[PDB]
Amino acid sequence: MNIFEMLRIDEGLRLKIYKDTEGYYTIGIGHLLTKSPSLNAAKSELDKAIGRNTNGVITKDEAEKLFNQDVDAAVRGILRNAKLKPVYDSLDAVRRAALINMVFQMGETGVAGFTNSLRMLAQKRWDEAAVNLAKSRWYNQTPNRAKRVITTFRTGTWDAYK
Numbered sequence: 001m002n003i004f005e006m007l008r009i010d011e012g013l014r015l016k017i018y019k020d021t022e023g024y025y026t027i028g029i030g031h032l033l034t035k036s037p038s039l040n041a042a043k044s045e046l047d048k049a050i051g052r053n054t055n056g057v058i059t060k061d062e063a064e065k066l067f068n069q070d071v072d073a074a075v076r077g078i079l080r081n082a083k084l085k086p087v088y089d090s091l092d093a094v095r096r097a098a099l100i101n102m103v104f105q106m107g108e109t110g111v112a113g114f115t116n117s118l119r120m121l122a123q124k125r126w127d128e129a130a131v132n133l134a135k136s137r138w139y140n141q142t143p144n145r146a147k148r149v150i151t152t153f154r155t156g157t158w159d160a161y162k
């Protein structure tokens with residue numbers, strides 16, 4: 001199991017514009033297009049991202065290309081973040097993937113905001129961090145996903161995904 005397979009389970013794959021859990025226009029493997037309520041704005045953002053007149057539909061290959069870009073961007077975003085990087089550097093391979101999953105979903109800023117949990121993770125106090133992670137809007141809104149990510153941090157294995 002690896003980050004890609006992990007996020008592919010968490011996000012799914014849709015080849016036509018759809019709205020995410022928050023009602024935002026998305027496509028592919030969790031690729032957010034816009035927070036704007038307008039479908040045209042989404043379609044415009046889509047064409048600009050793909051480089052062709054898509055008319056709101058993309059192919060598998062195209063979805064996979066945005067996904068590679070988005071995963072690469074999340075990692076580079078963590079490594080650029082003065083708050084995230086040291087956490088990231090202190091973790092093992094599996095837990096690093098859990099942190100990348102969070103950033104992919106809620107952005108760097110978003111995650112950098114879990115101050116207390118981050119400190120706990122940095123300190124390798126797994127159970128405590130898991131508990132702290134759970135008191136969040138994130139957990140309350142998307143609990144099944146949150147729970148898989150939390151178990152991954154708590155245990156250091158991919159069991160939640162097998």
Ligand SMILES: [Cl-]
Nearest residue numbers: 048049066069
């Ligand atoms: Cl893009």
Ligand SMILES: [Cl-]
Nearest residue numbers: 142143144145
């Ligand atoms: Cl969920």
